[PDB]
Each structure stands twice: as C-alpha cells, then as structure tokens.
Amino acid sequence: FVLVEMVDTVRIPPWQFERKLNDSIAEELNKKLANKVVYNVGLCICLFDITKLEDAYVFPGDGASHTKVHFRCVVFHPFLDEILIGKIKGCSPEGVHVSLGFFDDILIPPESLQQPAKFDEAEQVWVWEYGEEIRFRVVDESFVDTSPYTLVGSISEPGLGLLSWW
Template sequence: MRTKHQERMLLEHGYTAQKTHSNPLILPYFVQMLAFSSLGTQLELATTFSNSYHYRKESPPADFPFPFSSGALVLLVTMFVLVEMTDTVRIPPWQFERKLNDAITEELNKKLANKVVYNVGLCICLYDITKLEDSYIFPGDGASHTKVHFRYVVFHPFLDEILVGEIKGCSLEGVHVSLGFFDDIIIPPESLQQPAKFDEAEQVWVWEYETEEGAHDLYMDRGEEIRFRVVDETFIDTSPTGPSSSEPSTSSATEEVQKKEAPYTLVGSISEPGLGLLSWWTNS
C-alpha cells in the first residue's frame, strides 16, 4: 500500500528513480569538492551544481547524492528485537558446581543461538534472565529442571525496514543478498530497479539506467553492498513431520525438496530511489 502511494506521490512531484540522479560517472570532481565543505554549504553547492548540469529543474536539489566522507560510510544496518520467552532448562549434574545463572545462560545459548523460531525470527544471543522459578529434580534423572523467564535478542526486521547487505549472487529468481549472519534474502526481478535485465553470460542482474546520453548498464555484481527494503517475510515450519501413510511414495521427492528450504526468508525490494547498490547513490 505504502509503496504504491509513494510511487504516485513521486510521479506527481515529478521525480522518479530516473530523475533523481544516481549515476556516479558524472560526479567525481564536484563530489570531492563537496566533501570538504560543511553540510549546509553542500546543500547549496548541490543546488547550483544540479542546475548547471542539466538536472531537471523539478527534481529537488536535495536529491543530489552528495557523499559524507565517501567510503567511510559502510552501513550494514540490521534490525534486532527483544523477545520475551520462558523455557524449562535442564542442567546436568556436572554443571552443578557452576553458578546457576551461568549454566542456564550457556544452555539457552546452546539451544537457541543460530536457530530460527517459527514466526519469531533468528535468535542471536541471550539478553538477560528476568526470573528464575524453583528448580526440580525428577525421579530417575539427576539433572535439575528450572523454569526460566528470559529475554533473547532476535533478528527480525519489521516490514518496510531498510537494511544494507552484500550481494551473494544473482540467478533468474532474482538477487540473493546476505547480511553475513543471515543469508536467506531474495530480491525478486520485479522488485529491482526498472528496467532490469538478466545478463545470461555473466549471470548478473543489470539495471539499464537511462540518461539523456543513453542507457547505462549498472551491474549488480557479487560482493557489492546493497540497500533494500524488506517487503515480505516467510516462515516455513521445517520441523520433522511423522511418516504419512496415506500418501503414495511419489511424495518423498517433494519432501526432500522441502527439507532444503530455509526456515525464514526475507523478500526485499529496491524499486525506489535511494535503494540499490550503495555506489549508485553515493559516489565512491
């Protein structure tokens, strides 16, 4: 909803991705000059510059991509939330010599870190323990069982969140992006900056950026940093299911395919001005 609305606004105001300029080719000299001035003057300079270089008048001067200490701004922004959980933690007898809190912290990190909890997100690490209930020892087991209330740091960007990651590769399905600790991010072809095409020879997506001098091919190479908006998320329950007797043997193939699926996938979009490779919008 938001995107559509924004697109309409952009069209009405007369600046779209094509008009807000991103092409690094033209800028280097001025950009260096700008970097030396304070931000206030940068804006003024940017205005004059944009007029003198046949930027379209209606495009807002502030859209001029001036860099602030270009190259220094490596943004890999991620989104974390705190999630409140309870769990019963089993502490084996050989851990009794340690402090209960330490033992529980270790157990919780062992159990949850680097795991995706369904509809919650990717667990990173324990934040704190808010409450410990009484510990019990059950017959036949020497371990103690403690109900723990705790808070966990979880990677779960909300929708519309803007993240910066690294391109892991391109395929016909779109651009695959990695955040380093989280790899299951895909930007489908229809969400790329338009017009986009897939270069079969180099296996890379290209934004055919149009200027008045002709089209520039902006390649989305592997390893480049890319800023994208999170537009959708999918959780897949990958927990093992029991054998289904009713289904015929042909289902085994599909089950195997499902096994490989990522439990938590983010769908990104870069079809807005400001999104895409960082080098498109700053000049480096």
C-alpha cells in the same frame, strides 16, 4: 532486531552443579536457540538477559535440575520498514541474491521494481545500468516438519536514487 521474551524449562545435568545457575543456564540456552529461526518469531541469535529464574526442581527420574527460565533473547526480524545493507552473494536470472554480511545468506530478493533496465542474464550481470542496500518487504517462514528455506524474505529496491553508487 527485536527482543523476544521467552520461557523455557532448562535442564542442567548434575555434573555442572559447581557453576552458578544463571551462567550455566545461559550456556545451555545459547546451545538451544542459536542460528535457529522460530516460526512467526524470527532468527534467534543469543541470550540478552535472564529476567526471571525460578526454583530448581529435581524430578523423580533424571536427578538433574530443571529450572523454568523466563528470559529475553535478541532475535533477527525485520519490521517491514527497514533499509538494510547487504552483499550480493549470488545472482540468479529470476532475481538477485543479497546476503547480510556473514549473517544469513537466505534473503532472496525478487527483482521487478527497479528502473526499466532490469535483467539477470546468467552471466552474473547485476543490473543493466542506468555494499548494496535492500528493503526487506514481507515476512515468510515455512514450518519444516511434514511426515514420519524457513525464513526467506522478499526484498525490494525502489527509486532510492543511490547517489553514491548509481
């Protein structure tokens, strides 16, 4: 997890002029940047605070109010030094699929580095033996638009020993 300072031009429609701005911008910005990975940034989640909100213009068209909003939002972005704890929501013969608990089932570990009893043989064998720990290793995101996924990870499992569970 990491804070990301962001700047957005948030448009409040004119039937919300009863509510306070810093709340009613926050209700919009959650609908703008939740469950959405930003390229080279990470998976945005929610709104931390609005650090600076500047003055509400109203443009010659819409009649709405457009406030340029500086804020900070918490995002999900592993730092290439994190030993996370997830769950195996799937097993493919090329590599296991781990999922952080109801977070994102999009972390796909390749499996080449654990102890020399390694295969997934399509009958859902986890590992040939001697919560699940994970080492997130690389950042890898692909911008989708191409014509008229997207944070995938590669996840390792070294000689941790795993004293509690094998």
